[PDB]
Structure formats: C-alpha cells, structure tokens
Amino acid sequence: GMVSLVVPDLDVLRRWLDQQSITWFECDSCQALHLPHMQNFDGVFDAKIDLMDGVILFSALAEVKPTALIPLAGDLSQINASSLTVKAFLDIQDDNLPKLIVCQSLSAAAGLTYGQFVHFMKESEEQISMIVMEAFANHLLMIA
Amino acid sequence: AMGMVSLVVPDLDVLRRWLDQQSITWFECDSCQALHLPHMQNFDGVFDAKIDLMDGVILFSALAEVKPTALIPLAGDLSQINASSLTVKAFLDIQDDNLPKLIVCQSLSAAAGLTYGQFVHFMKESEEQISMIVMEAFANHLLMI
C-alpha cells in the first residue's frame, strides 16, 4: 500500500525508535541518540544514531589495542570489502585509545519511510555487530 | 513531509528503466551482471564505474588503477578517505596478476522498497561523492592514466 515519505529530523528518528521499542539515550555534550543495547556485543563501548547534512548514520565504537593498530589498519580494505553496506575506519587521537568506527548510513534528503528506517536499523545492527565481533574474536579490541 | 508513495523492490530491469528516465547511459559486460556507466570515465582516474544489485542492495562503485609507488601511502590514508564522506566507502583490491585497484563506492538498500526519487538522489549523491574521492587521489598523483 502507501506510506508516508518524510525528510526526518531528530524528533522523527526518536519516535521511529520508540515505535520499534529500541531504547535511546542522549549525551549532554553530543548530538547523537545513543543505543545502549549495542553494548551487549563484545568490544562495543558505544553505538549511536547521528543525523548529519540529511544523512543518518548508525555507528558503533570499539577501543583498539595499541599493538593491533597496525595490523588493523592493514586489514581495513578486506573489512570494508566484506560488507555490502557497512564501513569501517580508524579514529586515532593523541590523547586517547585509538577507536574502530564501524558504521552504516541511510541518505534521508529525498525522504524516507518508517519501514525503510526499520530495515536500516536491522541490517545495520547485523552488519555492524558482525564486523565488531569478528574483530573482538581476532584479539584486536580492548574489553569495554 | 512530502506525501504518500508506493514503494517498489527493484530488480535489474527496474534499475535499467530508472537509469533511462534520467538519461544515464548504461551497458552490460559479457562477464558480469553489472550495469556499467560510461559517463563516469570522464573523471580522471576512473577506468570503470558500475551499478550492481546483490542480495537486496544496490552498489554504485567506481574503479581506478593505483600506481605501485602510491599503494602503501594510499593504504595508510584509507581511514581518512572513509572518514571524509558520510556515505561513500573506499578500499583496495590487489591481485598478483594486475595493477592494484582503488574501489570507491556507495550502497542503497533496496529490499524494503524504494521510490524512483530515492534512486535519483542516490545516483546524484554517489556520483558527487565518488568523483570527489577519485579526483582528489588523481590530483595527489596516486593513480594511473
């Protein structure tokens, strides 16, 4: 049948997460909707929903072992090639543990439907969790 | 808030039609199911671009050939290239028989349905983001002719 096509803002996303019974919290310092259930996957210290220039991003963050940083940076092509949708890259700071970011995007500027968002939440959770769990099994990550 | 639509799950024929409606030329390899996109070869570096449909996901990918001397440096900048776009991915495909390739790509998840307008948005945003990545790598002398 027919469905509403909507250009969403963060309130739309929050309501759509409630409609899925997916729990979210906020950071006071940050603009994302954080997803506590993703910390049930080993290696995940945070996961979140951002909205940035009309694109939705679901990302998960893992802390990387300093000794695995170089082998991981050398695995990035194969990790990115392993998923049709998910992408993985490193975020390295001078003040902190290096981070693996594993993320999927959904472009929202031409409108989305609720069902498209639901599918996104499920496909992303699956594809993201797979990469991060694999990295955890390969002894690359710190326990959260 | 732009109204009611009816979504379609496209197959490859749907995508052919949708590319026809945007007057985007495509053609078919003897040896893939990808819809190749000649117009992408007008961006320096790009030796091939195509659309694939696989397991309910559309992929718009461009391929460029990387100079052997730029391979390690490019391997080192992948995180930054992937962090620089909200939607495009980039990775290396290296064979013993050929030159290394840089693969720059964007996906559109199709299995829950799409409107034609979403697909159009995808082609325009993919082209823009892919070309930006490939052009910058060309400018930085990482690619072959």
Numbering used by the authors:
A (entry chain B): 2 to 145
B (entry chain A): 0 to 144
Quoted from the paper:
AmyR from E. amylovora is a member of the YbjN family, which have been implicated in regulation of the stress-response in bacteria. Functional studies have previously shown AmyR as an essential regulator of virulence factors in E. amylovora. Importantly, the over-expression of amyR negatively regulates the production of the two E. amylovora exopolysaccharides, amylovoran and levan.
The protein contains 3 α-helices (residues 10–20; 67–82; 115–138) surrounding a 5 stranded antiparallel β-sheet (residues 34–35; 47–53; 56–64; 88–92; 100–106) with the concave surface facing the solvent and flanked by two protruding loops (residues 27–33; 93–99) to create a channel. Half of the dimer interface is characterized by hydrophobic interactions between the bent α-helix and β-strand of each chain, while the other half of the interaction face forms a hydrophilic pocket containing 18 highly ordered water molecules, and is capped by hydrogen bonding between the two N-terminal tails.
